Amino acid sequence: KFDIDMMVSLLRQENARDICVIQVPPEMRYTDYFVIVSGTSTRHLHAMAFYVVKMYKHLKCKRDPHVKIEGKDTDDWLCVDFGSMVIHLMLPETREIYELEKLWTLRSYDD
Amino acid sequence: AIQKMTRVRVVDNSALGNSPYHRAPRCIHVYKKNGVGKVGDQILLAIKGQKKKALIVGHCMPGPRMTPRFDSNNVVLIEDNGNPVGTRIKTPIPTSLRKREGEYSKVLAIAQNFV
Amino acid sequence: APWSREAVLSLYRALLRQGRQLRYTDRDFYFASIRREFRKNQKLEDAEARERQLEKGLVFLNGKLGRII
Amino acid sequence: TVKIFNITDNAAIKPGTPLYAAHFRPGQYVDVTAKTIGKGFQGVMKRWGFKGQPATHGQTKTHRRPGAVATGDIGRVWPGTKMPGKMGNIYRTEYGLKVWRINTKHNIIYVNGSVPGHKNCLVKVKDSKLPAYKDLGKNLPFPTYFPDGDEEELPEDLYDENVCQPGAPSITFA
Amino acid sequence: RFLSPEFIPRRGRTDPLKFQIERKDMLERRKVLHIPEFYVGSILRVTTADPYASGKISQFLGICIQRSGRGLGATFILRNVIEGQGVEICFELYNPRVQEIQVVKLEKRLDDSLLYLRDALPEYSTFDVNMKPVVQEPNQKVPVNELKVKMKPKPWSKRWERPNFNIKGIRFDLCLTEQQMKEAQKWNQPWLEFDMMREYDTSKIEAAIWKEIEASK
Amino acid sequence: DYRRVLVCGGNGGAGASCFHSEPRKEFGGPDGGDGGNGGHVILRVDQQVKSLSSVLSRYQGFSGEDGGSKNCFGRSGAVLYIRVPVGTLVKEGGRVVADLSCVGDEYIAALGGAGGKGNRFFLANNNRAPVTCTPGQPGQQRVLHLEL
Amino acid sequence: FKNKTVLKKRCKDCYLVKRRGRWYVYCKTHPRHKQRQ
RNA sequence: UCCUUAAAUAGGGAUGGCUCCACGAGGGUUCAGCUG
RNA sequence: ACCUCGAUGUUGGAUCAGGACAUCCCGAUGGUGCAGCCGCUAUUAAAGGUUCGUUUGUUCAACGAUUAAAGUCCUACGUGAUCUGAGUUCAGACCGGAGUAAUCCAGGUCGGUUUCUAUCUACUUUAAUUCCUCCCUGUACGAAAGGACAAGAGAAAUAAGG
Ligand SMILES: [Mg+2]
Ligand SMILES: [Mg+2]
Ligand SMILES: [Mg+2]
Ligand SMILES: [Mg+2]
Ligand SMILES: [Mg+2]
Ligand SMILES: [Mg+2]
Ligand SMILES: [Mg+2]
Ligand SMILES: [Mg+2]
Ligand SMILES: [Mg+2]
Ligand SMILES: [Mg+2]
Ligand SMILES: [Mg+2]
Ligand SMILES: [Mg+2]
Ligand SMILES: [Mg+2]
Ligand SMILES: [Mg+2]
Ligand SMILES: [Zn+2]
């Protein structure tokens, strides 16, 4: 199967510089897993994003519709939305300026 | 239905959206073959004497059943590349944005509440 | 200033406990984030912001609004 | 009303034989032809969707009138020019409408989308001619459906696979 | 006996068999999903599966501001304000993806259509999302809330003061001058309540529909 | 690596010299429209481009349309853009006329000749029927050498 | 193909053939030489 | 050349001659609202 | 200076457009200083399409934002017994200039009546196109940077018919 275990395994194999995972509660109507990863540069971000997308496409879930790759034009933030999980690749500055961690752990208790 | 010249509410944490200005933001162009903007459609916007891209995230015009009809034409500011200008969205954002064609993961991630 | 002097320390202890069994995420990054959150801010707040800060920390500890796995 | 259907000799049926809604089946694609709603003599703006003229800014007695009907050189009006006249009340056909369900008890066909003509209007229904649906008649009753055959008494309602049948548990997109 | 509005058909030349079929389908769906009794102005919580999300349930609580449509396609539009943002949703009653409908607070309002709540103050549309359901006595007429809302400045979505709307839940004295009221009275149309051929009598239709419902039971 | 390019800026249109005449005004005055300017040739730096293989050896900046009658102006020549690698030294005769190292940088190599004026431009109270129509200025034509 | 009123062989391998009603100069070594009447 | 618009052939500002207080169905520009 | 001076002002705009192809886009090919993507050039193709705004009568033009493209023309510089009169055209009045003056002006400005009930001809219900996204596939090609076809799927937009 293609699950968050596959996510973390592939991301660690390609050596994401920093990884984080949020278990989105079901009562929030977005997804199940919110993965946020930082990378060295835009080239590395694009490489790892394409790698994970290839693994998704090749592994299983033929009946599952194919998956976009958003943020290709931008260099500092890409994002891939899977059926049950969403991965957000970015750089340290983008991560620290958008603070997705606080947003998605403290829904209404941050600025 | 956000057309040209519509006054739109910038529902975002961005300085451009939250800063006072004698002229309210107005749609300058609707990035659609027909100049009619629905949820998820991009638009140009005149903020503070500046041209900025933005995304429609709700409008007064009724849509298909089961979708929310907001009291004001809400819009989120996005850079040319696509990164949202602001870092937070306060008012609810319709969930239908997820499955629509186009990139909306960044906007959904920034969003706090869904409806 | 805070709800109690020991409340913040107990909350930090509990957060570190919950990070002990951290499986998927980067443990070092998680610890760094917690250190940043509890050091860059918790030095010189006003007597009022302490309640909000500890409330949000407690909610994060609880994790019914999304937990780190 | 009597309508003529072009058929191959394979499908000839003895005159007097009845036909039933089950002659079609869910998932089939069908063509429905009928007289559209008659709107009588209608102006050019409603009949052909002309832009008309502005309401103000001096327009004197020209708000819904046709503009120049033709150029000055030809000294005539081309045949087939779009002009005010009777609209509707003509036979139009909708092609490739999916059959979503068939109520056998009342002989009702649930055809996707709109059909020409008013309510309680007689429509002529036949298998879709579109190339995509050229050879989909393998499983349909070829001559017609014969209830007298009684090979298998059909249920009260035949549903297409994707139709959310009433009485089924509320759909969850899991 | 509360017959849901959608059952009663709007008069027309459409054949009664179509209504019979539609009522059969509606009742057969109601056998699965309990559609509780409610009126315009009553607070409802609707739980529905999100198709955009992976079936994750979504709950929306709001005051039903209008009941429209007939037959299977009948809808009710209900309103609320979330973080100060007015939101209205039109829910189809018989959509197979509405998991549940809960009448959080069953009550009737002075008007059969509360569309003017858009122009009324936000307080009259605000409702706590987590408000607990109230309980009404099993044998008790539905309460009629005689609240008269205060309206914001005159520019409104519609000319509510006009007689054709026949609004009773607005404090017109507070927002409109006597001169404005007199001007609005120019559209009175007193004969419209006395032209007897305009009235639609649905006694026999309601009786037949009740017989059909009882047979379905 | 290295490419000799011949950029030729556009030529401004030559203004027209005509006069108006209408039923109830026979001497309606000048109608000579001005000519459009020639389109400049601008080397814009491109980050994606990494070698000078793409750039051609002959660039001809579009020339502006000549002015017409009825005071009609001429469409100015559109700008011709030469995408070049970041860090491209542009030299005429060993002059290093440009460096072009930063992203978004651009150097105008051959400026399109300005458009010629029409007689209506010279129209004035003193001059009630000018016949002059300044010819459209020729466009620049220079040989620039590109070195990475 | 370039349209020419007079067809001229440019290199040795260029050959003239009358096809589909008109003359053509075809060339394998230098297909640049392709000409049509 | 500056302001006004995203865009400005529009508008505003850098003895006679100045001086617009008030007024104008005069001629231009304009904020906001308004509206088929 | 050949018809029309024995009631047709004219330019723009609105409306509807018919037509040519010397093709702006979409289609098919040859060449290339065509590796791929972009392009350039030539042959064939007129079925379909060919945007909205600011200034200004303005056609045009400049500028803003787009588009696959915002094609060149003819049609009494198409069409005003279908519309408008914003410039321009009479009577009024100013600025500048000529003139002794009356007055005048290819200049600038403010204003300024747009009739027609249709006799005849003609006519009045005659298989869509394109963009984008995904797949192929960050595959072919390339050293890399970049980055394709074809085929398929999904979304839209316009147009026709309901
Ligand atoms: Mg500005
Ligand atoms: Mg109109
Ligand atoms: Mg009128
Ligand atoms: Mg309104
Ligand atoms: Mg103006
Ligand atoms: Mg002679
Ligand atoms: Mg040709
Ligand atoms: Mg001519
Ligand atoms: Mg005039
Ligand atoms: Mg004059
Ligand atoms: Mg005037
Ligand atoms: Mg006047
Ligand atoms: Mg007239
Ligand atoms: Mg007439
Ligand atoms: Zn040869």
Spell out the domain ranges in chain A.
1-111
Q: Which of residues 42-81 of D touch strand I (CB under 7 A)?
A: 48-54, 57-62, 65-74, 76-81
Using what technique was this structure determined?
cryo-EM
Residue (of C60, B111, E83) closest to A98 by Cα position: B111
Run of H or E including E81? strand E75-82
Give the domain extent around C52.
1-69
Nearest residue to E160 via CA among E152, E146, E170:
E170
Written as six digits, the tokens of F41 are 């040739």
Taking the C1' atom of I41, which residue's CA lies nearest? G2
Can you spell out the DSSP letters for F125-146?
SS-SS----PPPPPPPEEEEEE
CB distance F70 to F33 below 8 Å? yes
Q: Which segments of E1-116 does DSSP mark as H helices, in order?
A: 16-30
Instruction: Please state, as a whole number, how many other Cβ atoms lie within 10 Å of the Cβ of residue C5.
Output: 8
Check whether residue F1 has its CB closer than 7 Å to nucleic acid strand I. no
Interface of A with C in 4-43 (CB under 8 A): 4, 8, 18-25, 28, 33-34
Q: Which nucleotide is nearest to B46 (CA to C1')?
A: H6
Buried b or exposed e, range D17-29, using 16+ CB within 10 angstroms: eeebbbbbbbbbb
For chain B, list residues whose CB is within 8 angstroms of any CB belonging to chain E. Answer: 11, 58, 62, 65-72, 74, 90-92, 95-99, 113-115
| Residue B51 to residue B43: CA distance in whole angstroms | 10
Provide the domain limits for residue E105.
Answer: 1-217
Interatomic CA distance for residues B70 and B9, integer angstroms: 11
**Residue B39 belongs to what domain range?**
1-115
Of E52, E85, E95, the CB nearest to B70: E85
Q: Is the CB of B23 under 7 A from strand H?
A: yes
In angstroms, what CA-CA distances link A19 with C19, D16, D161, F63? 14, 76, 43, 57
Nearest 10 degrees: Cα torsion B12, B16, B17, B23: -170
Q: Pairing mode, if any, of strands D85-87 and D40-42? A: antiparallel
Q: Which residues of C touch A (CB under 8 A)?
A: 24-26, 29-30, 33, 52, 55-56, 59-60, 63-69
Domain count, chain B: 1
Nearest to A21 among C63, C65, C69 (CB): C69
Task: Compute the distance between CA of residue B17 and CA of residue B85 in angstroms, rounded to an integer.
Answer: 9
User: How deeply is B109 buried, as exposed, middle or buried, from its count of CB atoms within 10 A (0-12, 13-18, 19+)?
Assistant: buried
Q: How far apart are CA F38 and CA F33, in angstroms?
A: 16
Pairwise CB contact (< 8 Å): B87 & A80: no
Resolution in A: 2.9
Say how far apart CA A38 and CA A16 lie, in whole Å.
Answer: 6
Beta bridge partners of B43: B30, B54
**In this structure, what token pair is assigned to residue F110?**
């051959």
Q: A2-8: long-range contacts at Cβ-Cβ below 8 A with a sequence spacing of 24 or more?
A: A2/A55, A2/A56, A2/A59, A2/A60, A2/A61, A2/A82, A3/A85, A4/A33, A4/A35, A4/A85, A4/C24, A4/C69, A6/A55, A6/A59, A7/A33, A7/A35, A7/A52, A7/A85, A7/A87, A8/C24
For residue E209, give the H/E element and its range. helix E203-216
Distance measured from the CA of protein residue G31 to the C1' of nucleotide I32, in angstroms: 10
C-alpha pair distances (Å), D1 with each of A10, D4, D35: 69, 10, 12
Residue E205: is it exposed, middle or buried by C-beta count within 10 angstroms (0-12/13-18/19+)? middle
Q: Concatenated DSSP letters for E14-28?
A: S-HHHHHHHHHHHHH
Q: Residues of A from 36 to 65 whose C-beta is within 7 A of strand I: which are they?
A: 46-47, 49-51, 53-54, 57
CB E44 within 8 A of CB E97: no
Domain count, chain E: 1
Nearest to E58 among A29, A32, A84 (CB): A29
